[PDB]
């Protein structure tokens, strides 16, 4: 045996799918891959002991009912290779809940009743991406959910695994803590003359206490699943979250826990969009330089943090000049 062929990159070995139709199981276009596996498989992101290693994590599109299978062409034998294969199955079991199915027949049996899946919580926003060309239109909804919603706790356990693959320093939250808020994005779709809901992404926000009587909601985790990225959903989600908290006088403004470069770019885009038509951000105001009243209006109208209001100023100042 060539042992080099028994070390495998876990970023390409882990195959993720979101399944709406049985044909999605055989369509490689529906397969997407982790950006991070270092929290399970080390800095090198490798598993040892298998050739042709495939780690299948397939999810029903809405409910995220899970199939988990480990496949391989061959593995090391301790009698002849004198070493044991990595416990890939046990490592994955550490970050997915029990009760997953282990074969495509049982997975397809669950897909038959996926029409029963409904979004959790309170509807905040509906939006459509309408064809300019006489083609397909797509329709999305954003909900605020909590652990009082039937089935949400178990769904969140299935969903949170995705953070390990897509956020470098993801860690699982304490859902017993009542200060956690949850914002969900679904896509509506039709199947067999019914209307179903597909999970698109989500955000967790910690309602951080500011003594004596205020909060400063902190964006903790935000994920738009790979197939939905770069299509405006993250911007709709962060805008909807700002608009939600805007209705609470006890909310000061919104921050983030350890924001990524991609998050900072998205936040700048969203907060510039919200501020651009505010009177304090007019061209004539911008040309006179940054004024505190810009941060005051941004905080009052949209719960924008003073640091972020200064960035909005800098970007809008660049926009009104050559």
């Amino acid at each position: 045996k060539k042992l080099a062929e028994y070390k495998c990159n876990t970023n390409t070995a882990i195959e993720l799918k979101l399944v709406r139709f049985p044909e999605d199981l055989e369509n490689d276009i529906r397969t997407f891959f982790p950006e991070y596996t270092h929290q399970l498989f080390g800095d090198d992101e490798t598993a040892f002991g298998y050739k042709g290693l495939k780690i299948l994590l397939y999810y029903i599109a809405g409910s995220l009912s899970t199939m988990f299978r480990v496949e391989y062409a061959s593995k090391v034998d301790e009698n002849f290779d004198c070493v044991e294969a990595d416990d890939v199955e046990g490592k994955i079991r550490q970050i997915i809940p029990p009760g997953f199915c282990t074969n495509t027949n049982d997975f397809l049996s669950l897909l038959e009743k996926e029409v029963d899946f409904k979004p959790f919580g309170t509807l905040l926003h509906t939006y459509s991406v309408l064809s300019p060309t006489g083609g397909e239109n797509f329709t999305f909804q954003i909900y605020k959910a909590d652990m009082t919603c039937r089935g949400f706790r178990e769904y969140h356990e299935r969903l949170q695994t995705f953070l390990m693959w897509f956020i470098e320093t993801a860690s699982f939250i304490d859902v017993d803590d009542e200060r956690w808020h949850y914002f969900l994005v679904f896509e509506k779709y039709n199947k067999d003359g019914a209307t179903l809901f597909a999970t698109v992404g989500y955000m967790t926000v910690y309602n951080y206490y500011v003594y004596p009587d205020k909060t400063r909601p902190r964006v903790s985790q935000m994920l738009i699943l790979t197939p939905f990225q770069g299509q405006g959903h993250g911007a709709q989600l962060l805008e909807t979250v700002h608009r939600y908290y805007t209705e609470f006088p006890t909310v000061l403004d919104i921050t983030a826990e350890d924001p990524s470069k991609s998050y900072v770019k998205l936040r700048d885009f969203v907060l510039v969009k919200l501020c651009q038509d505010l009177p304090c951000f007019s061209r004539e105001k911008l040309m006179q330089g940054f004024n505190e009243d810009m941060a005051i209006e941004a905080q009052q109208k949209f719960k924008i943090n003073k640091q972020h209001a200064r960035r909005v100023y800098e970007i809008l100042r660049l926009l009104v000049t050559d």
Partner: peptide
């Protein structure tokens, strides 16, 4: 695990 109110308490990747 992260502390109270934390969802990004995991290890950074070092290549």
């Amino acid at each position: 695990k992260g502390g109270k109110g934390l969802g990004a308490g995991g290890a950074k990747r070092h290549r």
